[PDB]
Amino acid sequence: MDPFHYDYQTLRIGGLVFAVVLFSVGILLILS
Amino acid sequence: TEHKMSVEEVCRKYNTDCVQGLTHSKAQEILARDGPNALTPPPTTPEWVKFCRQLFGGFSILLWIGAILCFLAYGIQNLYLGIVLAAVVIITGCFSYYQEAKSSKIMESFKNMVPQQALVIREGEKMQVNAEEVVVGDLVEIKGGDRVPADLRIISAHGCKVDNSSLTGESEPQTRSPDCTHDNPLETRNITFFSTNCVEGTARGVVVATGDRTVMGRTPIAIEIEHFIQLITGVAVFLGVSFFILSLILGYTWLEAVIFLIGIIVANVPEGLLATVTVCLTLTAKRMARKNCLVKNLEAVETLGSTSTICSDKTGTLTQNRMTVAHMWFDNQIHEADTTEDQSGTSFDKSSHTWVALSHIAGLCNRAVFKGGQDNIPVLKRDVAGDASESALLKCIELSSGSVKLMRERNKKVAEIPFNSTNKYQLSIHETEDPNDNRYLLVMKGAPERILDRCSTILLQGKEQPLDEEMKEAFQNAYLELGGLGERVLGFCHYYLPEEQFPKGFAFDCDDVNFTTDNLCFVGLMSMIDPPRAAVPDAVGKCRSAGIKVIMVTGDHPITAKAIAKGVGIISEGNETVEDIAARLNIPVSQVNPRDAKACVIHGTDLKDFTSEQIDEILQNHTEIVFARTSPQQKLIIVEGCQRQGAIVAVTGDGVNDSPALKKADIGVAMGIAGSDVSKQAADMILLDDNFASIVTGVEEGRLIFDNLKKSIAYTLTSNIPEITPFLLFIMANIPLPLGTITILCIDLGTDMVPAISLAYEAAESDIMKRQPRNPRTDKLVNERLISMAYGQIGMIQALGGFFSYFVILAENGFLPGNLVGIRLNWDDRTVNDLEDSYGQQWTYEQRKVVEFTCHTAFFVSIVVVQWADLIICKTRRNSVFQQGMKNKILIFGLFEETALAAFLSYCPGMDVALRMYPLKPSWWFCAFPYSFLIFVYDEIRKLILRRNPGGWVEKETYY
Amino acid sequence: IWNSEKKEFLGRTGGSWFKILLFYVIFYGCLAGIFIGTIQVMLLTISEFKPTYQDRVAPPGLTQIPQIQKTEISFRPNDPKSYEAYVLNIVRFLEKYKDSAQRDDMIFEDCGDVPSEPKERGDFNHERGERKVCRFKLEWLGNCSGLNDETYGYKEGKPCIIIKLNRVLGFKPKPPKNESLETYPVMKYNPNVLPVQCTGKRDEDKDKVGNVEYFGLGNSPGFPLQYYPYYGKLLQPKYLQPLLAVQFTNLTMDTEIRIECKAYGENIGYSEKDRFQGRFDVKIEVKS
Numbered sequence A: 001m002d003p004f005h006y007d008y009q010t011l012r013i014g015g016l017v018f019a020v021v022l023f024s025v026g027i028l029l030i031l032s
Numbered sequence B: 001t002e003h004k005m006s007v008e009e010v011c012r013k014y015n016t017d018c019v020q021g022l023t024h025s026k027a028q029e030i031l032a033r034d035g036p037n038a039l040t041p042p043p044t045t046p047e048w049v050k051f052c053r054q055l056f057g058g059f060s061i062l063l064w065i066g067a068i069l070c071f072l073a074y075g076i077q078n079l080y081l082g083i084v085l086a087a088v089v090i091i092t093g094c095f096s097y098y099q100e101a102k103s104s105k106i107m108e109s110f111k112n113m114v115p116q117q118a119l120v121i122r123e124g125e126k127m128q129v130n131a132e133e134v135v136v137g138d139l140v141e142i143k144g145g146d147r148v149p150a151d152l153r154i155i156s157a158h159g160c161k162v163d164n165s166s167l168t169g170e171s172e173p174q175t176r177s178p179d180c181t182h183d184n185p186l187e188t189r190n191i192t193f194f195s196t197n198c199v200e201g202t203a204r205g206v207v208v209a210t211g212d213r214t215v216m217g218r219t220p221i222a223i224e225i226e227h228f229i230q231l232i233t234g235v236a237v238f239l240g241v242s243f244f245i246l247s248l249i250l251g252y253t254w255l256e257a258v259i260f261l262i263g264i265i266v267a268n269v270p271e272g273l274l275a276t277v278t279v280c281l282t283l284t285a286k287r288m289a290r291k292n293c294l295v296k297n298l299e300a301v302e303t304l305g306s307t308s309t310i311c312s313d314k315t316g317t318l319t320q321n322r323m324t325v326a327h328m329w330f331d332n333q334i335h336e337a338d339t340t341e342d343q344s345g346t347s348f349d350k351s352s353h354t355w356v357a358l359s360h361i362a363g364l365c366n367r368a369v370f371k372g373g374q375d376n377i378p379v380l381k382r383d384v385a386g387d388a389s390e391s392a393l394l395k396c397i398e399l400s401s402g403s404v405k406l407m408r409e410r411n412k413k414v415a416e417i418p419f420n421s422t423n424k425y426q427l428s429i430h431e432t433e434d435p436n437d438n439r440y441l442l443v444m445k446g447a448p449e450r451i452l453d454r455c456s457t458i459l460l461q462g463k464e465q466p467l468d469e470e471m472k473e474a475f476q477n478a479y480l481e482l483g484g485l486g487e488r489v490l491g492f493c494h495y496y497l498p499e500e501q502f503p504k505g506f507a508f509d510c511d512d513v514n515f516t517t518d519n520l521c522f523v524g525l526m527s528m529i530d531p532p533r534a535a536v537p538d539a540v541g542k543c544r545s546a547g548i549k550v551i552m553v554t555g556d557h558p559i560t561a562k563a564i565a566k567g568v569g570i571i572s573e574g575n576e577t578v579e580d581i582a583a584r585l586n587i588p589v590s591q592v593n594p595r596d597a598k599a600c601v602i603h604g605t606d607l608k609d610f611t612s613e614q615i616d617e618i619l620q621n622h623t624e625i626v627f628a629r630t631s632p633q634q635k636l637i638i639v640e641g642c643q644r645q646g647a648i649v650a651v652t653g654d655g656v657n658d659s660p661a662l663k664k665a666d667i668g669v670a671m672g673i674a675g676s677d678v679s680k681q682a683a684d685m686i687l688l689d690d691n692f693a694s695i696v697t698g699v700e701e702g703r704l705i706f707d708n709l710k711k712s713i714a715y716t717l718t719s720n721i722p723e724i725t726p727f728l729l730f731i732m733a734n735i736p737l738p739l740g741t742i743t744i745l746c747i748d749l750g751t752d753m754v755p756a757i758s759l760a761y762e763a764a765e766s767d768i769m770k771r772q773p774r775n776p777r778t779d780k781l782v783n784e785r786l787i788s789m790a791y792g793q794i795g796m797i798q799a800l801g802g803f804f805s806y807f808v809i810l811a812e813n814g815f816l817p818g819n820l821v822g823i824r825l826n827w828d829d830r831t832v833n834d835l836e837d838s839y840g841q842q843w844t845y846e847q848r849k850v851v852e853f854t855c856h857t858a859f860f861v862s863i864v865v866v867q868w869a870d871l872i873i874c875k876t877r878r879n880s881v882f883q884q885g886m887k888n889k890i891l892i893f894g895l896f897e898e899t900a901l902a903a904f905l906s907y908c909p910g911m912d913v914a915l916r917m918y919p920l921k922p923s924w925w926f927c928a929f930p931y932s933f934l935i936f937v938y939d940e941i942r943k944l945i946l947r948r949n950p951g952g953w954v955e956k957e958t959y960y
Numbered sequence C: 001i002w003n004s005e006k007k008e009f010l011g012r013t014g015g016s017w018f019k020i021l022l023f024y025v026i027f028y029g030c031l032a033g034i035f036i037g038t039i040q041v042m043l044l045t046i047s048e049f050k051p052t053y054q055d056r057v058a059p060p061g062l063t064q065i066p067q068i069q070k071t072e073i074s075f076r077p078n079d080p081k082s083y084e085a086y087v088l089n090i091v092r093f094l095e096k097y098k099d100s101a102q103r104d105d106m107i108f109e110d111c112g113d114v115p116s117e118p119k120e121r122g123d124f125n126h127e128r129g130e131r132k133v134c135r136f137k138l139e140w141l142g143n144c145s146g147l148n149d150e151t152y153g154y155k156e157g158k159p160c161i162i163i164k165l166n167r168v169l170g171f172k173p174k175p176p177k178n179e180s181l182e183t184y185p186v187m188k189y190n191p192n193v194l195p196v197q198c199t200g201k202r203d204e205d206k207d208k209v210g211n212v213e214y215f216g217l218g219n220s221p222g223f224p225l226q227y228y229p230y231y232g233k234l235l236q237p238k239y240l241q242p243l244l245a246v247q248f249t250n251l252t253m254d255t256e257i258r259i260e261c262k263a264y265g266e267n268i269g270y271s272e273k274d275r276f277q278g279r280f281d282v283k284i285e286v287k288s
């Protein structure tokens, strides 16, 4: 409600999940 | 050390029987004791010395010391500089090691890919076995054109000349004799030195020393890349020093200035270009060697992509070299051999003694066996050791005769001269089978027209007939008829030595010929059809479309050479020679205009009297050339004369006498299954199989290397502009710095250096063999078009994408682009803690720095996003991605991994205190998507324009 | 570096040089076209009265008015030329706070003389015109004994440093909802003020630090809340933010004093990395 607090540590979790997904997809692709 | 004394005591010392040799059981018994016959290799590095050589060695120990000093300085109170230095050295060294420990491993495989063989005689049998396990006792055999396996004490020589060229270095071939000549082991004649090639003749010796206890046991592309790297590094150092001084003038506490200098230097130079080039060459060498195409040096890989002429012989290369007899000719009757087991057809009469004389001339000149133990195996499919024409004649005779070895043992030969290409005659003196007339037989073998002039008599239906002028015309007509079918024939004849003129005890001399070899009779000749290889016509077509001029330098008659050329495709349809044109027009060949014929057949005899200008004009004014009945010295003649007009000529050779031609030619191609060791070691390229389609495949690989290298270099160079432009605008326009040094390292030492390897695995384009060969002189790896396309068309769009992202973040946080100009002085001032933004708010220093570092991070992310499309468009430089496909998975792996690294660096907690990288909102990942799409669309359109109209302005000024 | 390369008989390393330069000019003009278009399309999606993101502007920092190069205030109270820079900077800042420049003209307004609740003048949009601003009187700071409207630290005493809170658009500071905090003024009242304190750095420096005096609106240490929230430069030009003059009466001569000033509150936060967010440090010393 207040435009002075952004919900970090939730963006960080999403970014790390996305990076892990990309890394796993690349590793699986090299193994195909 | 045993040449002084006789052979009986040397042979008993090593427990050897001179006639037989060593038993099989004793071979391993002595091998396991003494060990292998090979010189001890120099000691190998423990595989961690080179690691530290590349990390802590060279010009990197200074950077390591600086990083340690910066870390210490941070500890007592700075950290950024230490992290930057440590990252630079660690990543650069590790990458340079990974590409050096791979190329070395691949090149280690070529030592044992082709084996070294020696001809040992053990237990009364000669076998071609690897020369590593040569024991110090067995009896070995050496033949002209081979290299000795170990030190040999000659026991039975046959005029064998051994050229050392390794101790003395003199290329003069020294003859070898079984008798002692000098007490000095270094210049005696009994001893043959180790690792010395045998030029001519054949000698048998007993090995006295193996392994260490022996006499011997006591690229342009890289240069061009290095020059370009040195030039760009000079420019980078100049710019970096200038801007470092300027930053000090502006005032940046001597440590932000060093960071600026490091950022500029890292951004302006490609840090992994040379290792990438080396690994590209090595990977393509392995790919070439996987197919039957082996290269000795890495320079032959750089060449062979600019090949414009192939001078390949006929037999073995353009034909399978497994000849089955088809036709005969005797008594003016063209007979054909029916090879059926049941003897069907009965087209030929066997009872005539002309055929028994034919077997008695063509049955004992051959040196052919069947390894003794063959039962139930048909004579047609029985394996033979020897030549092809030899033992092809035996497959012919054995269907009629019934004794593989009995009849050959019935007589015995007293004279023997090995068949040689230059001498061309095969002679042997045999005792007659007749018990009342035991005369001495004489035999002939070679070119039918070269032997016909040696005969003034000819058998006809049973009895000799005098020299007939019509007989010569009949022989020529029969030769034409048999050669028109793409067949090679052998003309041979026999003569009985007079009984009273030559007493029946005379020794048959070898050097000084005393037997009459000028007035013999003539039995006949037979055909030996050799069909061409299956994949050869396709290879000749591929060469024709690729602008490679194929020249056949054969060694037999012009008619059969022309026939096999026409069958293969060397002489294309609709193209005619001057003699065929004259025959069509019934015109004398003298007055036929030579400009109406583009194919020519050159006889070898006429080639000896042709001058350099005549050879040059013959090569220049013809496109389909064959050289019939030539010798390897003449092969040197064509090889030398064909590169005088800017050609990269690759020639094939297998004999001992072909070595100067192979050395003179740009690419010397030896033979892996039929070539002598001299040619195999004097060449830059070995055909694991003699196919001539493997030559074209190797040429295709050599062409592909250049395309892949150009693509990788262009992709690596593209990302230099967006990493140097932000610093340019940071001082020219006075805006907050949009790119830090760690970010520059991530752009350069990250998404640029490492994914460039993935472009080396790209498949060959559709038109790879449909364009003219590259010019080694006027065409370079790095040219103005590549620099233009990298630094002015793609780099600028990438920089625009990064700057758009930077402006988006700065505007969304308050600082509109209007009042960003000229704010650099107050922005970077630590004493100003109330800087006013566009909306009127006031920021502390560490509150503006967070926004600036987020801008840096999203600049990095936008560079990654645009380099997605930059890597996609660099897959092809002539075709389109939609018609090329995403075949290689290494490229997609690189894309996913660079994006994963980008998304991990920003979002990982605790990375905003070490690398100064901050998380960016999800909306900011799509800032550079329009510019990536623009890059893709622009290159697709440009390549479509290039394909539509070749040779236009786009190709002239943009086709890198 | 060959001389036979500039102009043989046709041109300078190319034919007429025209098509390549024309192509590059058209290409770069087009690229500037897409860049300008994309920048404009981006500017369409942002607001004119409030920034898209304001989380980066954390609880606003605290700043003192004498801009000092190395957070040090070192001066000899004998020579007037030693403290000329500080006095000049204070005067340049306070020029806009003089009563001669605060005339209504449908711009300024007579604000309360005691701290009051925040004045919400409407929403952060353009249905109303330009907003009015509460006026600040320079006489509210004053001095215990000296020249009238004096902003100088003369031979006696120390320059009266002016403490100001950074402006954040649409920010309403929240005073703490408690009593007997680290701030112990003579008259302590939680609402309508943002308490500030100026103590020493350490025990060794709290000695002989003197009795600091806060000269603000209502004679209580704080920023009166009637001046908040800020409505932006476009909507509130000539907006006078509250000030707070702090004067150090007696101090040790020729002894460096490290003083840390805070601003306690509920919205106000503190960061370890940022030394100027919600608090600040100063260094003072007088030379004999």
Ligand SMILES: Nc1ncnc2c1ncn2[C@@H]1O[C@H](COP(=O)(O)OP(=O)(O)CP(=O)(O)O)[C@@H](O)[C@H]1O
Pocket (backbone or CB within 6 Å): B313, B314, B315, B316, B387, B389, B390, B419, B421, B424, B425, B426, B445, B446, B447, B488, B489, B490, B553, B554, B555, B556, B557
């Ligand atoms: N062992 C042999 N004995 C007698 N004549 C032979 C022979 N081998 C080949 N010939 C014939 O004599 C000539 C030998 O010359 P050469 O051996 O160099 O030609 P070639 O048959 O090997 C074709 P290429 O040079 O392409 O391999 C040929 O014309 C061949 O028909």
